[PDB]
Structure formats: C-alpha cells, structure tokens
C-alpha cells in the first residue's frame, strides 16, 4: 500500500466547501438533511413479503444515496477520473481499496492518468470480496456499487428491494444474504473515517461496538445507529442484528438499539430482552430446572 | 443546609454566596439555587452534580445544568472537601438582587426508552431541604 | 428464536408454533427446545411454564405420567421481558440452584419401593 493508490480528482463546480470533508475531519456540511430524508421510509411502511427470496439488479436513482432502502447499482469498473475520495468497500468491516489498471495491479498515479480504474468485482462475501462500496465522486456526490438487493415481493405495489437485514418484512432476508453496502439494519450502518463525508446526514448515529461473524471470520465493527431517547421500541419495532456479541458486565450482550441476536440465553434457550434498556440482550435466562432424562427409571 | 449572611455590592466586582451542607457527608447530595426577586415568583437558576460522570442529568456531560437565563452568566459549583456549595457572579448587576435560596435537589432516575450507557442517569428533580435564603443588594 | 406473523409485520417471539408441538393429553406440552407453549384457555391467553427445556405444564407442579388437545397459539409474548438479571443472582443460581449428579441417581434408584402401579 502507498498513498498514490488513492484517486484524488476533486472539482468544485458547485457547493463550495464540500471538499473540506476529505482533507479535514469534522468539516462535514450537515445541512439540508430534513429535506433529503423526506423520502426515506421506515421498514415498517413497506409491503409484507412472502415466498422465496429472489434477486434483482438495483438500478436506482441518481439522487444522493443517503437512505437505507436505496437499491445500489450492480458493480462494474469505475474510472479513477471521477473519484475524489478514497474508496471504501464493505464486508461486515470497511476495507480501503485503491486504484488499478484493468490488468496491472497497482497504479501509483493518484488517479490522475487514464485507464486507471477501480476494479470493484464483488460477489456476496461468504465466497469473497464485499457486499458493496461507497465513495465520493469528483463533483461532490456520493455514489455506491453493490451486490444485487433481494427481491422480497409482497401483495401490493410498494414492495421492497432489500439491501439490508429486512427481518420484519421477510424472516429470511438476513444481512448475509441481502446485504449490499454498509447498511446492516434499516437504522444502522458500518462506521469508517469518512462516514460523515459520504453520508453526511448520519449525525447523532450513537456509536456501538459490535461483533459480527460471517462464514468463518469475526469482524469487530463500529456501528453507527439512529436512536433518540424516548423513541418507541416495542417488539414489533425490533430488527434482527445477526451478531455474535460482546459482553457487558456478566449478564448482558451488546446489541444494536431495538434489535436482537438470534443467539439463545445459556440457561433457557430463549431470547430475553429488556423493556427500558434498548440496546441489551440477556445471556442468562432465569428459570431453571433438573434434567428429567436423568431420572427416567425403568 | 445553612447559607451565609447578607451581602451588598456595587455593579461589577464579584459576589459569592456559600452553603454549608451540614448533617451528612456528600455521599449523594445534590444542590442548587432558586432566585426570588422581591415581589416575584421563583426562578430556577441551576444545580450541580456532586458525583461522577454517570449522572449528568440526561445529555450525560455537564455537571452543572442551568436555567435559560443563567447559561454562563452565573456559576454554580461544589467544594467537596469543605462540603460547601457556591453561587458566584463575576460581574454583579443591579438586577441581581433579592433572595437567593440554596436547596437540596432530588433527582429522579431516567425512564422510558434509553441506552445501556446512560442507565444510571437521572432527569431533573425537585427541591426538598431548603436553606433560609440570603439577601443580595446591588446598587450605586 | 420463533417468528410471529402478527399484523403483517413479523416479529421475534419465544412462543411455540404448532409445528414444534409434541404432546401428552395429561396437561403437558412437549416441544422442540427453544420456545414456550402459550395456551389461550378459552379466551384468556395464559402462558404455560417450563419444567424441563422441552416440556411445560399449566402450573409447574410436575404432573404424574392422535388429534392435538391444547389450543396453543403464538400469543403471550412469553418470557420476552423478564426482570433484570443481577450478576449475583446469576452466580447464585449457577452455584446453588443448578445441579446434575450420578451418586444422586443411584441413591434414588436404591430407594425405589417398586410400587410400580402405572
């Protein structure tokens, strides 16, 4: 690795200061989000799915991809000439990727020369590579690349193409099968040094330390989640997190707010959640007994 | 608690009112101040946290939350070695007069939906043990 | 980990689906481990209590020893929200209340009156 593997083509044709967030940290714009988020629906507002899960090519809009439901475009080669910032690829963890020729591996050109591209070939990670990538382009717009979103289906017209773990609309739509890009749950995304530049509206995304296990590999993740004290958090509001959690004290797992893992409590085999502490799960159920097989005398 | 005696100032200078939180050690004794201008009702000035970082009201940082008219204009602090609470002005105005009451604050635990890391936090409470009230006069 | 279909919005539950049910007509529900049977007796939705990781009854009293006769349902929201597990409490149950053995099994076998009336 060398810094000349990072494309740096930054052109201020508009919105002067956008570039500030590349060089400086904590120089994000953070303005106009109330309007941009106007079209970002909750998972609960989508049609219920059913039937087997299929896949589709996420040929989405050219508006800024700042919403979890945005279907990412299928990946292919991206020219370095259009890239300002570093390119981050997401496996459960962020990965920095650099420039390449179509055939040669390094291109230590800073992305200034032609034929200098980002390969970006991906197939869901249990096999290799990544779920999807995010980067800032040369004029200040965030663009994404990723695995085909899941075609969930449903009875109505407002069906969902799911790039994330859409448990409440379809029970099998796990991150490991539907994930594309950094969104883990509709309200949580994988953190990285440029998250507030690429997704500048993710201000107040309280950070959590979580651990996710895919295939045979553990990833220690920084999770950024949307949570407001007092926000409703009933069972109907809880998403599946697919975590292999870190321990808090001796009795609780750290989970994303209003989410749960599928791992059972040690003593009961059941899932035990707290009503008021939003981001915890118990690893120990309270009820216990004596094994009956031990006394099945003839 | 017991408050210090009467004080008179000219505009400017500085003024300090102290409270002796006697009868108990500062295990978990919160204190704050309430102002009453002559002929007026009560104004919350602010409170201070005698404890650690776990209990800073809800935001979870400042040990000293103040009412809206006291946002940096007056300082509230506690000397933990002398069990003494203070209210201080670094510029006394002619309007800063009347009775300043010092009272023990009684926080109420956080409720509703919240995160693990803030589970020990408290919301704003009420005032239980009141001191006698001290008189401040500011004039030319 | 079971999922209730509810109102069209799916959610996590510990309530046993019928596909997990094995049973005895003598008030006992046997089931795939990992859930607790809910019985709406008539209308009341009353949750049965585990005796073993796979068996529950109406009151936890260890009762003495084909169409299904139980009216189970994915209702109750069983043990989803227990009270807080205290670090001390967990240790206490693991050291004191919890208990597998063999010497006990033998002591029990040697004391059977052999009044095997069942």
């Amino acid at each position, epitope marked *: 690795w060398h810094i000349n593997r990072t494309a740096l083509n930054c052109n201020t044709s508009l919105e002067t200061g956008w570039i500030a967030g590349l060089i400086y940290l904590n120089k994000f714009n953070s303005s106009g989000c109330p309007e941009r988020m106007a079209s970002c629906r909750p998972l609960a507002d989508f049609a219920q799915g059913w039937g087997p899960i299929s896949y589709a090519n996420g040929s989405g809009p050219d508006h800024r991809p700042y919403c979890w439901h945005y279907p990412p475009k299928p990946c292919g080669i991206v020219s370095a000439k259009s890239v300002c910032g570093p390119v981050y690829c997401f496996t459960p963890s962020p990965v920095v990727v650099g420039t390449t020729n179509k055939l040669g591996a390094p291109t230590y050109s800073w992305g200034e020369n032609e034929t200098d591209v980002f390969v970006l070939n991906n197939t869901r990670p249990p096999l290799g590579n990544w779920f999807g990538c995010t980067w800032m382009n040369s004029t200040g717009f965030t663009k994404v690349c990723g695995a085909p979103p899941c075609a969930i289906g449903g009875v109505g017209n407002n069906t969902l193409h799911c790039p994330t773990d859409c448990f409440r609309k379809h029970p099998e739509a796990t991150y490991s099968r539907c994930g594309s890009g950094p969104w883990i749950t509709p309200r949580c995304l994988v953190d990285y040094p440029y998250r507030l530049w690429h997704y500048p509206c993710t201000i107040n995304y309280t950070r959590f330390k979580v651990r996710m296990y895919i295939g045979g590999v553990e990833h220690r993740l920084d999770a950024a989640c949307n949570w407001t004290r007092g926000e409703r958090c009933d069972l109907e509001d809880r998403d599946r997190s697919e975590l292999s959690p870190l321990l808090l004290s001796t009795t609780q797992w750290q989970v994303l707010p209003c989410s749960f893992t599928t791992l059972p409590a040690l003593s009961t085999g059941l899932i035990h959640l707290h009503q008021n502490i939003v981001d915890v799960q118990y690893l120990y159920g309270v009820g216990s007994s004596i094994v009956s097989w031990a006394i099945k005398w003839e | 608690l017991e408050q210090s005696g009467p004080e008179v100032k000219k505009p400017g200078d500085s003024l300090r009112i102290s409270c002796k939180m006697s009868g108990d050690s500062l295990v978990t004794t919160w204190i704050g101040w309430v102002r009453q201008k002559p002929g007026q009702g009560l104004e919350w000035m602010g409170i201070i946290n005698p404890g650690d970082s*776990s209990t800073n009201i809800y935001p979870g940082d400042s040990a000293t939350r103040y009412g809206p008219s006291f946002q940096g204009q007056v300082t509230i602090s506690i000397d933990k070695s002398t069990s003494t609470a203070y209210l201080q002005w670094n510029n006394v105005k002619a309007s800063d007069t009347g009775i300043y009451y010092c009272a023990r604050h009684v926080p109420v635990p956080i409720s509703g939906t919240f995160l693990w890391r803030e589970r020990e936090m408290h919301d704003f409470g009420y005032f239980d043990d009141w001191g006698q009230g001290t008189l401040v006069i500011v004039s030319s | 980990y079971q999922v209730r279909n509810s109102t069209g919005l799916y959610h996590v539950t510990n309530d046993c689906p019928n596909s997990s049910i094995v049973y005895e007509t003598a008030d006992a529900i046997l089931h795939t481990p990992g859930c607790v049977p809910c019985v709406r007796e008539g209308n009341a939705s009353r949750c049965w209590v585990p005796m073993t990781p796979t068996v529950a009854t109406r009151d936890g009293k260890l009762p003495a020893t084909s169409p299904r006769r139980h009216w189970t349902t994915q209702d109750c929201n069983c043990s989803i929200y227990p009270g807080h597990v205290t670090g*001390h409490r967990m240790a206490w149950d693991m050291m004191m209340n919890w208990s597998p053995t063999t010497a006990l099994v033998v002591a029990q076998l040697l004391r059977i009156p052999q009044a095997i009336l069942d």
Partner: antibody, heavy 122, light 107 residues
C-alpha cells in the same frame, strides 16, 4: 440454627490447618455455607463457599491454590483445609449461612448466621 | 475492585445520628446489593441492611438506609454506646465472582 466449630490450632509456618463446622437446627439442604477470614484488626475476607448435598464449591482466586473445602453430608459438617500457613493467614475463621434468595426473589438474604469463629495461629 | 468506607464513624453523644458511607464501582457496589454488618470485638458479625428486604429480625430501625448508583450508606440514628461496633459494607463482585468487604468503620 447454630454452627459449631471445634477447637483452635497453633502451627508453625508452612504447616497445614483444618477447621470444620457442624451445623444443626436446620436442614442444611437449602442454603450455602460460606467461609470468611478475618485477620486481627482487618477486613472480613471472602474465601469461598459450598453447596450442601451437591458438594459444589467455589473459591476466591486468592486461595484457589491454597485451600479446599468439602462436606460430610451425613455428619452435617463442612470442612476447610489450608495447605500451609504463611503468617498473613493468622486470624479468625468463620463459617456462615447464605440464606435463600429471599424466596420471592426480592432483596436476597445475606449471611445471618455465623459460627463463633476459630482461631488460627501461625 | 474493593469497597471503600471511612476508617471511623463521626461518633458523638447518644441522641445523635451519624452516617457511615460506602462507595465503589459498577462492577460490585453498583447493581447487585450492598449488605451491611455490625461487628463487636470478640464476636462474629451480624446483618443490618439489604437482607430480609433491608430489615433483619433483631435489628432496630436505628440502622437503616441505602443509596443509588455506586454509593451506599448506613445511617445510625441515636448513638447508644451499645452500638459502638465496627461496621462493614459488603457486596458481590462480578469481576472476581466472590464477595468483597470494605475496610470496616469504627464507631
């Protein structure tokens, strides 16, 4: 509900000691028996505990390589052995009753019944 | 960690109330519960607080109180000379999986 210790011991450094508590006035099937040490003028110190009947026992890491405890169930007696004395072990050793966990699982029952305390001199 | 309580009580005359404080971390004194015990020289200690819903039989109302967070205390209302015992703060420690006692406060 009395716990009865027997004797006291004086041993030179490096020597082992043994104390036991017989107990009566209760069933000794529904509570734990704890061991607590107190050097003269010092803090009560936790050593470990045993589950009557099961024989299950846990130890403080401080004594994990130094002590062991057992129970002679029909004798209603808990025994504790210290493999050797190291001067710092001088003091009074007590056994105590860890009551149920309030039964209704409210505030727990702490150690309400303590034996007299045996004296161990290094 | 280790529970911390003062080495001595404020003391005073009969009719006076004193408070014996105790503090620690969230790994022991916080959460769980904090037992309080009374010990006179020459004997075994006995319970005062956080047992039997904080009021054990045989113990007068004289000995009472509790605190939130990682604090605890024992208030002794009326310093009868018969109460000049050492008092101990005890709690379950979730790091070491055992009991922790404080230094002992002398009244």
């Amino acid at each position: 509900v009395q716990f009865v210790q027997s004797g006291a011991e004086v041993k030179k450094p490096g020597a082992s000691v043994k104390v036991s508590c017989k107990a009566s006035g209760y069933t000794f099937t529904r509570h734990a028996i704890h061991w607590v040490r107190q050097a003269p003028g010092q803090r009560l110190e936790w050593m470990g505990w045993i589950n009557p009947g099961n024989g299950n026992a846990k130890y403080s890491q401080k004594f994990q390589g130094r002590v062991t405890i057992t129970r002679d169930t029909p004798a209603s007696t808990v025994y504790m052995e210290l493999s050797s004395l190291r001067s710092e072990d001088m003091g009074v050793y007590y056994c105590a009753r860890d009551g149920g966990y309030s039964h209704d699982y409210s505030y727990f029952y702490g150690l309400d019944v303590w034996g007299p305390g045996t004296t161990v001199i290094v | 960690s280790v529970l911390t309580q003062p080495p001595s009580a404020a003391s005073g005359t009969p009719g006076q109330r004193v408070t014996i404080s105790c503090s620690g971390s969230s790994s022991n004194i916080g959460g769980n519960f904090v037992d309080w015990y009374q010990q006179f020289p020459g004997t075994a200690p006995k319970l005062l607080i956080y047992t039997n819903d904080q009021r054990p039989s045989g113990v007068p109302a004289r000995f009472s109180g509790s605190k939130s967070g990682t604090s605890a205390s024992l208030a002794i209302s009326g310093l009868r000379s018969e109460d000049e015992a050492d008092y101990y703060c005890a709690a379950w420690d979730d790091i070491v999986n055992g009991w922790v006692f404080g230094g002992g406060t002398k009244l």
